[PDB]
Every structure is written in structure tokens, then in C-alpha cells.
């Protein structure tokens, strides 16, 4: 239908795009496709484009959708990504309302992971969001959508007023020159409110009201939620972006280090503070594919028919 | 043909927590924007939650913030609503109702907040702002008005919505967006809004008219909610 992709059905939408399932006709694995028309895009739009894709191909993370294959077409652009069989953590709190302070913390320890990993690689998300942070068959986060993604040099300020508005940092509104990772970190806040409260800790009837209110800096903090978390919010949705904790800080917060010792969680955020598979190349070698042409593609970052094909079939 | 079918009435002892289904069956089935709204024996109206925003997954009027928990089953079209730690004051019909204008929401346009349908209600029992006058009379053919006083934040922001309750029924939409009637109200219904204040007017009365009659508004207060009045019991005098 679309390549080596017989599409099966819309799952969501996307800027000037389409989110659709895939099977993968040769590995009959599946994928999501983001089919963006070129027709309704300017000069900066596909920029924006370019720049979502190459930071993509620069993300190798277990909590992070992984970029299969980039096709390209006269009208149209293909991306093709691994498939998060849970969907949206928004749809997952819709279905089952707030989650319980120890399945939050499990998922908020993976979105940091992933959010710090970013920052270690000079790159910021800037659209943190609910319906951003999928779920693979298991429940566990796969941090998606970078069009607002950008790289960033530590002391640097950035300019451009994006993301979603209520996970929105004061200083976006405001249209200030910001501090990255900041940013993310005001948005994490929110975030992990509205895990453990199933409601934002800002909203309104329009972006007008709803910007009132993150100007504002205040939220309620509902009876359920502990004294540890209460501590951990308040502390990171902080107006003065100077004030809040850093990623080092969120991840040894008293509410983080709560419960049973996790090392798999301190081997993830140790990591970011820093073989080949001859099984797949024999079989992709009998569906008549040159081994050497496939290194080659892997080398290259090429992401086409033979990088999408080994990527695949590892799983 | 569209219709909120609710789950049936029970008895929970204090303590415990209550759940109650909302089914959208017939005609236009797909996404909507359903609220849970309660009203204690011989009491008003009150809005509890629901879907208010195009940004979030619900939202809660801060008085139940605590204890209401409000899921959805899009497959099935069931809309849930959980309410924990009763206590007797919990005692009340929960109605689910459904934002009229949930089509055209954006962001950008600022809804009415009317309510568009509502489920028959659910008796849960416990065992073990705006300001209307409470009464209103009148003689048959007179024309009566209630007054419905707010704040900047709800009537001199957003738009105001009449309902009209008969005994032993849901409330139903009689004016909305200030002036309009939905098909079915007559002419003798009229709605006006001024500054921070709002009237609803009834020429011509009849005894078909008596029956209890609530105002309403959002509010922009807090992260929002849907604000109601006290009521108005209109009583047609001999």
C-alpha cells in the first residue's frame, strides 16, 4: 500500500498529518506512520520537519519510540516508528482515572529517564504531554512526538514559544528567553500531577483562562496525594525557573527513593551520565538481501528499506 | 432517539465508596462532553464534574476533588462516575448530562456549558453561588421574572442557561447561550443578560409552569466549573 506498508487504520492525528497503523509486509510487524501532505507546508514548517527527524535518529533509548524508516515522496513524507500497543497515558487516565502513587512513581521514573537522556544528548522536548508519553504492550513509557524538539548548548537561551499549553512553562507565555531543560522540567511537573490526580493543575475554559492560571503559579493539592509528592511538585512547578530542581534533584527526592530500592532505576540515570546481530543478518540475507549493503545502511543512517528491515527483525 | 441510560438505585453504608454508569444509547453515537450533577432530596442542583476543557482528562468542582473519580469506556459508550467515603449528606439523585456544544470546542471558542441531555438519575442513598429568589408566584396569564445575581468571573464572562424541573424529572434546557430556546420551548420563555445579572421571563403563565427553575453559568474561577443557582419554585396562584 504505502511501500512495504499495508495500512490498517487511523490511531490518532498530528500536525498537518495522520497518525496510521502498519503491518510491515516482510517482517508482519507493527508500526505507526505520521503521513504528513506536503502540499499544505511552508518553507519553515518542513523545516521543522527536518529537524524532527534528524533528532529522532540521534535518540537510541529503551523509553523512547524508536524511528524505523524516513520515505519521501513528490506530495508526501512518510515516518515510520516503532508501534506503543498501549497508546496514550491521556486515554490510560481517562479509562481508570488518577493512578495510585506507586504506579505513578514506576511510570514517572521511566519518563525522567528518557527526559534525561534527551538532555545528556544537548536536546530538549519541549511538548511534554499526557497524550505525548505512550505505552507499549507491557505499560511501560515510550516518550513520542518531537516536532517541537530542539539542541540545545548548556547556558544557552532559547526562542522559540512552543508546547502544549497546559503543560506550558510561565516564561513560553510570557514569551521570554529560556533555559531548556527548565522548560521540561516545569512540564514533568505537570505531568506528574496529573498522574496522581487524573486532572491538570491548570485549566480553563479557553487559553486565555487557562494562561491566567499558569501565570499564577498556584494549584490545589488534593487530599490523597502524600506530603513526599506535595514536596516534589511544589518544587518543580516553581515560577522562577532558576528555583526548581534540576534532573539530579528530581531523581534522589525523598518521594523517588520511597518504596522498594530500585538499582535499575539508578543504572538508567547513571547511564545517561556519560553489538551486531549476525542471527538477523543471515536471515535478511535469505529474503535476498546483501549483507554488506545492509551495514552500509546501518552505517550511514540512511534509515531505508535495510535499516527499518534489521531494526525490526531485532525484537 | 439519543438517551443517557443510568445504572439503578442502591444503599451504601457510610464509609464506603458508589460508582454509577452513564450508557449514551441511539441516534449520534461517538465523543461527548458528559458532566455528573447531583441534587440531595428537596435540595438544588449541583455540579460534581466532567469534561470541561479540550485540555485535560477531567475536571473536578474542588468540593469533590477528593473523593469523585470520573473514567470513561469509549468502547462501550459508558461513562463512570466513583464517589468515595460517603457520608449521609451523599444522599442524592446523581444525573449525568451532556455539554451541548462539545462540537465546536478549540480552545479558542468559549462554550456555554448548557446541557444538552440528561440521564433519568440515580438514587444514591447512605444508611446504616449564583443567587435566585427561592419562590416566585403569579396569577395565570401574568408574566413572571426571576432574577439570577453573579459575579464577573461566572455571568459577566460566559453566557447564561435556564433549566426547568418538574417533579420527579431531570432538569431540562429552557433557555441557553442567554436568549435561545431549544425546539419545543414556546415563545412565552424569554432570557436576557445584563452586566452581571440575568432574567428569565415567563408571559402568559399557565398552570402547566409550576415547577422549579434553575440558572446557570461557568465560572472562570479556580481551574473552572459550572456554577448553579439556588432555584425558583414558581407557584401559579388561583
Known amino acids: 500500500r504505502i511501500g512495504y506498508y499495508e495500512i490498517d487504520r487511523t490511531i490518532g492525528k498530528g500536525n498537518f498529518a495522520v497518525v496510521k497503523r502498519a503491518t510491515h509486509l516482510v517482517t508482519k510487524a507493527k508500526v505507526a506512520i505520521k503521513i504528513i501532505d506536503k502540499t499544505q507546508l511552508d518553507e519553515e514548517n518542513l523545516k521543522k520537519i527536518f529537524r524532527e527527524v534528524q533528532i529522532m535518529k540521534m535518540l537510541s533509548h529503551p523509553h523512547i519510540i524508536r524511528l524505523y524508516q524516513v520515505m519521501e515522496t513528490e506530495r508526501m513524507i512518510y515516518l515510520v516508528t516503532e508501534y506503543a500497543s498501549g497508546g496514550e497515558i491521556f486515554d490510560h487516565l481517562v479509562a481508570h482515572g488518577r493512578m495510585a502513587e506507586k504506579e505513578a512513581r514506576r511510570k514517572f521514573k521511566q519518563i525522567v529517564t528518557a527526559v534525561y537522556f534527551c538532555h545528556s544528548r544537548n536536546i530538549v522536548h519541549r511538548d511534554l504531554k499526557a497524550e505525548n508519553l505512550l505505552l507499549d504492550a507491557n505499560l511501560n513509557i515510550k516518550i513520542a512526538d518531537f516536532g517541537f524538539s530542539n539542541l540545545f548548548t548548556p547556558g544557552q537561551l532559547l526562542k522559540t514559544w512552543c508546547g502544549s499549553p497546559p503543560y506550558a512553562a510561565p516564561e513560553l507565555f510570557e514569551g521570554k528567553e529560556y533555559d531548556g531543560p527548565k522548560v521540561d522540567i516545569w512540564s514533568l511537573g505537570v505531568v506528574l500531577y496529573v498522574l496522581v490526580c487524573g486532572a491538570l493543575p491548570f485549566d480553563g475554559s479557553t487559553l486565555q483562562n487557562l494562561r491566567a492560571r499558569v501565570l499564577s503559579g498556584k494549584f490545589r493539592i488534593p487530599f490523597f496525594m502524600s506530603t513526599e509528592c506535595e514536596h516534589l511538585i511544589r518544587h518543580m512547578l516553581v515560577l522562577d525557573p532558576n528555583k526548581r530542581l534540576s534532573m539530579e534533584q528530581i531523581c534522589k527526592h525523598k518521594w523517588m527513593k520511597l518504596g522498594d530500592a530500585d538499582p535499575n532505576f539508578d543504572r538508567l540515570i547513571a547511564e545517561s551520565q556519560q553489538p551486531l546481530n549476525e542471527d538477523v543478518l543471515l536471515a535478511m540475507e535469505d529474503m535476498g538481501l546483501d549483507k554488506e549493503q545492509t551495514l552500509q545502511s546501518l552505517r550511514s543512517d540512511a534509515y531505508d528499506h535495510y535499516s527499518a528491515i534489521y531494526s525490526l527483525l531485532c525484537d | 432517539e439519543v438517551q443517557l441510560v443510568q445504572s439503578g438505585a442502591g444503599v451504601k453504608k457510610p464509609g464506603s465508596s458508589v460508582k454509577v454508569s452513564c450508557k449514551s444509547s441511539?441516534?449520534?453515537?461517538?465523543?461527548?462532553?458528559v458532566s455528573w450533577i447531583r441534587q440531595a432530596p428537596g435540595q438544588g442542583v449541583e455540579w460534581m464534574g466532567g469534561?470541561?476543557?479540550?485540555?485535560?482528562?477531567?475536571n473536578y468542582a474542588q468540593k469533590f476533588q477528593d473523593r469523585l473519580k470520573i473514567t470513561a469506556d469509549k468502547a462501550t459508550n459508558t461513562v463512570y462516575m466513583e464517589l468515595s467515603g460517603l457520608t449521609f449528606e451523599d444522599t442524592a439523585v446523581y444525573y449525568c448530562?451532556?455539554?451541548?456544544?462539545?462540537?465546536?470546542?478549540?480552545?479558542?471558542?468559549?462554550?456555554?456549558?448548557?446541557?444538552?441531555?440528561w440521564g433519568r438519575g440515580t438514587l444514591v442513598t447512605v444508611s446504616s453561588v449564583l443567587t435566585q429568589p427561592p419562590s416566585a408566584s403569579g396569577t395565570p396569564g401574568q408574566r413572571v421574572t426571576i432574577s439570577c445575581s453573579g459575579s464577573?468571573?461566572?455571568?459577566?464572562?460566559?453566557?447564561v442557561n435556564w433549566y426547568q424541573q418538574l417533579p420527579g424529572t431531570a432538569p431540562k434546557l429552557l433557555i441557553y447561550?442567554?436568549?435561545q430556546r431549544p425546539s419545543g420551548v414556546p415563545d412565552r420563555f424569554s432570557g436576557s443578560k445584563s452586566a452581571t445579572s440575568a432574567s428569565l421571563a415567563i408571559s402568559g403563565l399557565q398552570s402547566e409552569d409550576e415547577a422549579d427553575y434553575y440558572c446557570?453559568?461557568?465560572?472562570?474561577?479556580?481551574?473552572?466549573?459550572?456554577?448553579f443557582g439556588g432555584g425558583t419554585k414558581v407557584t401559579v396562584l388561583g
Open positions: 464577573s468571573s461566572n455571568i459577566g464572562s460566559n453566557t
Open positions: 447561550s442567554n436568549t
Open positions: 448530562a451532556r455539554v451541548g456544544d462539545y462540537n465546536f470546542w478549540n480552545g479558542h471558542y468559549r462554550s456555554g456549558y448548557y446541557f444538552d441531555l
Open positions: 469534561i470541561t476543557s479540550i485540555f485535560g482528562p477531567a
Open positions: 446557570a453559568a461557568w465560572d472562570d474561577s479556580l481551574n473552572g466549573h459550572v456554577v
Open positions: 441511539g441516534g449520534t453515537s461517538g465523543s461527548s462532553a
